[PDB]
Structures are given as structure tokens and as C-alpha cells.
Design a protein around this ligand. Structure first.
Ligand SMILES: Nc1ncnc2c1ncn2[C@@H]1O[C@@H]2COP(=O)(O)O[C@H]2[C@H]1O
Ligand SMILES: Nc1ncnc2c1ncn2[C@@H]1O[C@@H]2COP(=O)(O)O[C@H]2[C@H]1O
Ligand SMILES: [Cl-]
Ligand SMILES: [Cl-]
Lengths: 127, 125
């Protein structure tokens, strides 16, 4: 059953843009819609700079159906909620934060996304 | 450039066979080889792997290897992915969102953290 809708979270980090490269490849192969999301607490010119570069990276990896979503709020909430809202088949994040003791105990975006998601989660090895 | 070598872990559970189903489909769509791995301690095992092969085929995959590996699930999956130069490791989600899991460890969380490859955690339960 092919992925139809893939959501990828980027904060503009090089690590995260690697997560976008991969989501873009997976989307192009599944023939899926890719949704690039960037969560932020709000001026807001850099959020759209992040989304256009992510778009360019995803398009270079093959994706052709790409949507950009600037989302107001915290990263975990914004990605999980977005994924429920668009009925995403897959949610993609990088792995920054997964290995520190403080991230394991206090939280990180990939770990909390993995725990909270009701869909498949791809954790791209970006660091 | 796609994923070319996909590893999926199964213990024979129905939940882990849904992870095999998804890995099969990804392998098909990517044009990759699928490796089906079952970690154990010292054969139920070939029964398990034959079911998994059947499911993976049903899913579109054709280039399949069965690989039984000795040891604990996380160690065996992570070492195998290293040895076979896996581009993607696929596991199901049992234990991931439970406190028992934070306390005893879960396969998916430990794999996500310790693998050196992309990890797809399938929402199998
Ligand atoms: N502000 C954000 N918006 C969307 N996703 C984010 C944000 N911050 C962190 N993430 C995700 O968490 C990931 C942690 O590792 P990466 O930097 O490789 O990639 C990151 C993104 O996928
Ligand atoms: N002995 C094992 N061999 C390989 N993979 C395992 C083993 N035990 C658990 N797993 C993996 O961890 C996942 C936990 O959820 P599932 O049962 O959906 O799918 C399981 C497998 O992918
Ligand atoms: Cl560690
Ligand atoms: Cl719990």
C-alpha cells in the first residue's frame, strides 16, 4: 500500500535538510505528495527562506508534488498534529537529539514525535 | 538515488509481520534488495522467516534473503545493518510509547538511537 502523503519537518538546519532530501526521494518513489513543515514561535522572513531551500532540496531529489507549511507552535505538536490533519502515511524527521542523556530524559523532537505519532515514522540518520 | 538494501526485523509476531509488509513494499518501490532478519538465542526460526518471505513477496518484493542472527534483537539488527551496508532498517513499534518501554528498553527506540542507518519505525500496533 504505497505512501500517498509524506510529511517532513525542517528547522533550516543542514542536518534537517538531509531529512528533506530523504523524504523527497521517498515521495518521488511512492509518487506521493510531500509536505514540508517548519514549526516556529513568531519578522518571519527566515521561515520562508527555510521552506524555499527545503523545497529546492526536495525537488532536486525527485519530488514533484510539494507543499510548504509554516506552522505556528512547537515542533513536536506542529508535526504530529499536521500529520493527523492531512492523514499522513509517513512522517519524516532527522535524529538530532536522540542520543544525549538530556534529550533522552527531557525530550527531543525525534523521540517525542516517534512516541506520539499515529503514523509510520522515518528517522533519518542525519547526525 | 534510492534505498538499495533494506533490512526488516521480525520475531514472528503479527505486529512485526506488518513491519515486513511495509518493508517489502518499500523495497519494491525502491528497486532494493530486502533482508529479513530474526534475532534469537540458542527451528521455530525458519517457520518465522518463511512466513515473512511470503508476506514480503505478497508486498511486491522479489529479491529476498532470510537471515537468522544470534543475540539480542537490537545488537543483532544493528550489526547486520552494518555488515550488509543497509540503507534502511525497518522495525515495528511495540513498546515504543509505553513506560514499560522506557524502563526495559524497546527495540525501536534502541534501534533508532544505535543504528547508523535510517530507521523506519512502522506503526504496527
Ligand atoms: N522547528 C522545527 N520544525 C520542524 N521540524 C523540526 C523543527 N525542529 C526540529 N525538527 C525536526 O527534528 C529533527 C532533529 O534532527 P534534524 O536536525 O536532522 O531534523 C530535525 C527536524 O526534522
Ligand atoms: N527477535 C527479533 N528479531 C528481529 N526483530 C525484532 C525481534 N524482536 C522485536 N523485533 C523488532 O521490534 C519490533 C517491535 O514491534 P513489532 O512487534 O511490530 O516488530 C518488531 C520487530 O521489527
Ligand atoms: Cl549512547
Ligand atoms: Cl504507559
Amino acid at each position: 500500500s504505497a505512501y500517498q502523503t509524506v510529511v517532513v519537518g525542517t528547522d533550516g538546519s543542514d542536518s534537517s535538510l538531509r531529512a528533506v532530501d530523504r523524504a523527497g526521494q521517498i515521495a518521488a518513489a511512492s509518487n506521493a505528495k510531500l509536505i514540508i513543515a517548519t514549526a516556529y514561535f513568531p519578522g518571519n522572513a527566515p521561515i520562508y527562506a527555510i521552506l524555499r531551500e527545503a523545497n529546492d532540496r526536495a525537488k532536486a531529489a525527485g519530488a514533484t508534488d510539494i507543499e510548504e507549511r509554516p506552522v505556528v507552535g512547537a515542533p513536536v505538536d506542529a508535526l504530529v498534529e499536521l500529520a493527523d490533519e492531512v492523514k499522513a502515511d509517513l512522517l519524516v524527521v532527522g535524529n538530532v537529539g536522540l542520543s544525549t542523556i538530556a534529550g533522552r530524559l527531557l525530550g527531543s523532537v525525534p523521540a517525542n514525535v516517534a512516541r506520539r505519532s499515529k503514523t509510520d515514522v522515518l528517522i533519518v540518520h542525519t547526525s
